[PDB]
Protein backbone atom coordinates (compact mmCIF):
# COMPACT_ATOMS: atom_id res chain seq x y z
CA UNK A 1 0.00 0.00 0.00
CA UNK A 2 3.10 2.20 -0.13
CA UNK A 3 4.71 1.51 -3.50
CA UNK A 4 5.80 5.14 -3.63
CA UNK A 5 8.24 4.10 -0.88
CA UNK A 6 10.13 1.51 -2.93
CA UNK A 7 12.99 1.54 -5.38
CA UNK A 8 11.17 1.88 -8.70
CA UNK A 9 7.46 1.44 -7.90
CA UNK A 10 7.51 -2.17 -9.14
CA UNK A 11 5.34 -4.37 -6.96
CA UNK A 12 6.97 -7.71 -7.80
CA UNK A 13 9.41 -6.79 -5.04
CA UNK A 14 6.56 -6.75 -2.58
CA UNK A 15 5.09 -9.14 -0.02
CA UNK A 16 1.29 -9.30 -0.28
CA UNK A 17 -1.06 -11.82 1.26
CA UNK A 18 -3.93 -13.58 -0.49
CA UNK A 19 -5.96 -16.76 -0.59
CA UNK A 20 -5.31 -19.23 -3.39
CA UNK A 21 -8.89 -20.44 -3.23
CA UNK A 22 -10.40 -16.96 -3.03
CA UNK A 23 -8.64 -15.43 -6.03
CA UNK A 24 -11.17 -17.38 -8.12
CA UNK A 25 -13.63 -14.60 -7.24
CA UNK A 26 -11.39 -11.52 -6.99
CA UNK A 27 -11.38 -10.26 -10.55
CA UNK A 28 -13.20 -6.93 -10.53
CA UNK A 29 -11.12 -3.98 -9.40
CA UNK A 30 -11.66 -1.48 -6.61
CA UNK A 31 -15.39 -1.92 -6.35
CA UNK A 32 -17.07 -0.44 -3.27
CA UNK A 33 -17.10 -2.54 -0.13
CA UNK A 34 -20.82 -1.95 0.24
CA UNK A 35 -21.53 -2.96 -3.34
CA UNK A 36 -19.92 -6.36 -2.92
CA UNK A 37 -21.18 -7.06 0.59
CA UNK A 38 -24.68 -6.26 -0.65
CA UNK A 39 -24.18 -8.45 -3.69
CA UNK A 40 -23.37 -11.29 -1.33
CA UNK A 41 -26.30 -10.58 0.95
CA UNK A 42 -28.87 -10.26 -1.82
CA UNK A 43 -27.54 -13.40 -3.47
CA UNK A 44 -28.22 -15.22 -0.23
CA UNK A 45 -31.61 -13.52 -0.18
CA UNK A 46 -32.53 -14.93 -3.58
CA UNK A 47 -31.23 -18.35 -2.66
CA UNK A 48 -33.43 -18.34 0.44
CA UNK A 49 -36.52 -16.85 -1.16
CA UNK A 50 -36.52 -19.35 -4.00
CA UNK A 51 -36.53 -22.21 -1.49
CA UNK A 52 -38.09 -21.30 1.82
CA UNK A 53 -40.32 -18.38 0.86
CA UNK A 54 -41.62 -19.02 -2.65
CA UNK A 55 -39.86 -15.92 -3.99
CA UNK A 56 -42.63 -13.69 -2.61
CA UNK A 57 -41.23 -11.13 -0.18
CA UNK A 58 -44.47 -10.37 1.68
CA UNK A 59 -44.28 -14.00 2.78
CA UNK A 60 -41.51 -12.60 5.00
CA UNK A 61 -42.07 -11.74 8.66
CA UNK A 62 -41.25 -8.28 9.96
CA UNK A 63 -39.98 -6.70 13.15
CA UNK A 64 -39.69 -3.27 14.72
CA UNK A 65 -35.94 -3.64 15.23
CA UNK A 66 -33.79 -6.62 14.32
CA UNK A 67 -31.20 -7.57 16.91
CA UNK A 68 -30.30 -7.84 20.56
CA UNK A 69 -31.33 -11.49 20.89
CA UNK A 70 -28.63 -13.50 22.60
CA UNK A 71 -28.32 -17.16 21.61
CA UNK A 72 -29.26 -18.31 25.10
CA UNK A 73 -52.26 -6.58 28.81
CA UNK A 74 -52.67 -3.82 31.40
CA UNK A 75 -51.06 -5.66 34.29
CA UNK A 76 -48.66 -5.15 37.19
CA UNK A 77 -45.64 -6.80 38.77
CA UNK A 78 -44.24 -6.71 42.29
CA UNK A 79 -40.52 -7.19 42.88
CA UNK A 80 -39.15 -8.68 46.06
CA UNK A 81 -35.99 -9.99 47.70
CA UNK A 82 -35.05 -12.47 44.97
CA UNK A 83 -37.36 -11.25 42.21
CA UNK A 84 -35.35 -12.58 39.30
CA UNK A 85 -33.83 -9.92 37.09
CA UNK A 86 -34.10 -11.42 33.61
CA UNK A 87 -37.63 -12.59 34.33
CA UNK A 88 -38.40 -9.08 35.53
CA UNK A 89 -37.02 -7.55 32.36
CA UNK A 90 -38.89 -10.01 30.16
CA UNK A 91 -42.17 -9.41 31.95
CA UNK A 92 -41.56 -5.69 31.60
CA UNK A 93 -40.24 -5.81 28.05
CA UNK A 94 -43.13 -8.07 27.13
CA UNK A 95 -43.11 -10.18 23.98
CA UNK A 96 -43.61 -7.81 21.08
CA UNK A 97 -40.54 -6.16 19.59
CA UNK A 98 -40.74 -2.45 20.32
CA UNK A 99 -38.87 0.31 22.11
CA UNK A 100 -40.00 -1.40 25.29
CA UNK A 101 -38.63 -4.73 24.11
CA UNK A 102 -35.23 -3.03 24.13
CA UNK A 103 -35.44 -0.60 27.04
CA UNK A 104 -35.15 -3.48 29.50
CA UNK A 105 -33.10 -5.73 27.21
CA UNK A 106 -30.87 -3.38 25.25
CA UNK A 107 -27.95 -3.25 27.65
CA UNK A 108 -26.34 -0.17 26.09
CA UNK A 109 -27.34 3.34 25.07
CA UNK A 110 -25.33 5.66 22.87
CA UNK A 111 -24.23 9.08 24.08
CA UNK A 112 -23.07 10.62 20.81
CA UNK A 113 -20.93 7.67 19.75
CA UNK A 114 -20.34 6.37 23.26
CA UNK A 115 -21.96 3.16 24.45
CA UNK A 116 -22.83 2.99 28.13
CA UNK A 117 -24.87 0.78 30.41
CA UNK A 118 -28.61 1.18 30.23
CA UNK A 119 -29.70 3.38 33.15
CA UNK A 120 -33.12 1.76 33.04
CA UNK A 121 -31.99 -1.81 33.62
CA UNK A 122 -30.16 -0.17 36.53
CA UNK A 123 -33.03 1.69 38.15
CA UNK A 124 -35.71 -0.90 37.48
CA UNK A 125 -33.33 -3.50 38.90
CA UNK A 126 -35.69 -5.72 40.91
CA UNK A 127 -35.71 -5.12 44.65
CA UNK A 128 -38.10 -4.98 47.58
CA UNK A 129 -41.17 -2.78 47.80
CA UNK A 130 -40.99 -1.95 44.11
CA UNK A 131 -44.30 -2.36 42.28
CA UNK A 132 -44.89 -1.38 38.68
CA UNK A 133 -47.93 -1.25 36.44
CA UNK A 134 -48.44 -1.38 32.69
CA UNK A 135 -51.21 0.10 30.62
CA UNK A 136 -51.98 -0.31 26.93
CA UNK A 137 -49.57 -3.24 27.12
CA UNK A 138 -50.70 -4.31 23.65
CA UNK A 139 -50.33 -1.12 21.62
CA UNK A 140 -46.93 0.51 21.91
CA UNK A 141 -47.75 4.10 20.97
CA UNK A 142 -49.70 4.24 24.23
CA UNK A 143 -48.03 1.41 26.10
CA UNK A 144 -46.87 3.08 29.29
CA UNK A 145 -45.41 2.04 32.61
CA UNK A 146 -45.62 3.43 36.11
CA UNK A 147 -43.37 2.29 38.93
CA UNK A 148 -43.98 3.21 42.55
CA UNK A 149 -42.03 2.24 45.66
CA UNK A 150 -42.15 2.91 49.39
CA UNK A 151 -41.87 6.63 50.06
CA UNK A 152 -42.00 6.98 53.84
CA UNK A 153 -43.91 3.71 53.96
CA UNK A 154 -46.54 4.68 51.42
CA UNK A 155 -46.24 4.04 47.70
CA UNK A 156 -46.12 6.80 45.13
CA UNK A 157 -45.21 7.03 41.44
CA UNK A 158 -41.43 7.11 41.20
CA UNK A 159 -41.10 6.46 37.47
CA UNK A 160 -43.14 6.89 34.31
CA UNK A 161 -42.05 5.32 31.03
CA UNK A 162 -43.86 6.39 27.91
CA UNK A 163 -43.57 7.03 24.20
CA UNK A 164 -43.82 10.33 22.41
CA UNK A 165 -44.20 11.70 18.95
CA UNK A 166 -41.13 11.10 16.79
CA UNK A 167 -40.71 7.56 18.15
CA UNK A 168 -39.14 8.95 21.30
CA UNK A 169 -38.97 7.55 24.79
CA UNK A 170 -39.28 9.61 27.91
CA UNK A 171 -38.74 8.56 31.47
CA UNK A 172 -40.47 11.04 33.71
CA UNK A 173 -38.45 10.21 36.80
CA UNK A 174 -40.23 11.59 39.81
CA UNK A 175 -39.10 12.66 43.23
CA UNK A 176 -41.72 13.48 45.83
CA UNK A 177 -39.70 14.38 48.93
CA UNK A 178 -39.87 18.02 47.98
CA UNK A 179 -39.70 21.52 49.39
CA UNK A 180 -43.39 22.19 48.74
CA UNK A 181 -44.04 18.48 49.37
CA UNK A 182 -45.61 18.14 45.95
CA UNK A 183 -43.52 15.99 43.60
CA UNK A 184 -41.34 16.99 40.70
CA UNK A 185 -40.61 15.14 37.48
CA UNK A 186 -37.55 14.88 35.29
CA UNK A 187 -37.90 14.28 31.53
CA UNK A 188 -35.14 12.01 30.28
CA UNK A 189 -35.50 11.64 26.54
CA UNK A 190 -34.19 8.89 24.31
CA UNK A 191 -34.20 8.61 20.54
CA UNK A 192 -35.32 5.32 19.02
CA UNK A 193 -33.42 3.98 16.01
CA UNK A 194 -34.96 0.64 15.03
CA UNK A 195 -32.84 0.80 11.90
CA UNK A 196 -30.02 0.15 14.40
CA UNK A 197 -31.23 -2.95 16.18
CA UNK A 198 -28.04 -3.26 18.17
CA UNK A 199 -28.57 0.15 19.72
CA UNK A 200 -31.78 1.83 18.56
CA UNK A 201 -31.84 3.80 21.79
CA UNK A 202 -29.58 6.84 21.89
CA UNK A 203 -29.78 9.42 24.64
CA UNK A 204 -30.17 13.05 23.66
CA UNK A 205 -27.39 15.10 25.21
CA UNK A 206 -28.89 18.46 24.24
CA UNK A 207 -30.56 20.62 26.88
CA UNK A 208 -29.86 17.72 29.24
CA UNK A 209 -27.96 19.39 32.04
CA UNK A 210 -30.43 22.25 31.71
CA UNK A 211 -33.32 19.94 32.56
CA UNK A 212 -31.37 18.44 35.43
CA UNK A 213 -30.63 21.93 36.69
CA UNK A 214 -34.26 23.00 36.48
CA UNK A 215 -35.07 20.02 38.66
CA UNK A 216 -32.38 20.78 41.18
CA UNK A 217 -33.58 24.39 41.29
CA UNK A 218 -36.84 23.49 42.95
CA UNK A 219 -35.02 20.81 44.87
CA UNK A 220 -32.85 23.55 46.36
CA UNK A 221 -33.95 27.05 45.40
CA UNK A 222 -36.92 29.28 46.23
CA UNK A 223 -36.58 31.29 43.02
CA UNK A 224 -37.24 31.21 39.28
CA UNK A 225 -34.83 29.66 36.79
CA UNK A 226 -32.19 31.56 34.88
Amino acid sequence: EHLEAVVDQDVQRTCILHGPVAAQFTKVIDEPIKSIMDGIHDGHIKKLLHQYYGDDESKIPAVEYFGGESPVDSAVFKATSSTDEESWFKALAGSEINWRHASFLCSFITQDKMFVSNPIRKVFKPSQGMVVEISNGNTSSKTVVTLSEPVQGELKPTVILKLLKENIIQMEMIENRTMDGKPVSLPLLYNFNPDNGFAPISEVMEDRNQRIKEMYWKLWIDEPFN
Binding site: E57, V63, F66, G67, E69, P194
Partner: peptide, 22 residues
Amino acid sequence: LIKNKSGKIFVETKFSKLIGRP
Protein backbone atom coordinates in the same frame (compact mmCIF):
# COMPACT_ATOMS: atom_id res chain seq x y z
CA LEU B 1 -35.18 -14.17 6.93
CA ILE B 2 -36.32 -10.87 8.42
CA LYS B 3 -37.89 -7.61 7.32
CA ASN B 4 -37.41 -4.37 9.23
CA LYS B 5 -39.66 -1.36 9.70
CA SER B 6 -37.54 0.49 7.17
CA GLY B 7 -38.40 -2.37 4.83
CA LYS B 8 -34.90 -3.81 4.85
CA ILE B 9 -34.07 -7.45 4.42
CA PHE B 10 -31.90 -9.35 6.85
CA VAL B 11 -30.54 -12.88 7.11
CA GLU B 12 -31.38 -14.20 10.55
CA THR B 13 -28.96 -16.50 12.32
CA LYS B 14 -27.78 -16.95 15.88
CA PHE B 15 -25.12 -14.34 15.10
CA SER B 16 -26.76 -11.78 12.84
CA LYS B 17 -29.32 -11.41 15.63
CA LEU B 18 -26.94 -10.11 18.28
CA ILE B 19 -25.95 -7.27 15.98
CA GLY B 20 -28.89 -6.23 13.81
CA ARG B 21 -26.30 -6.62 11.08
CA PRO B 22 -25.82 -9.37 8.51
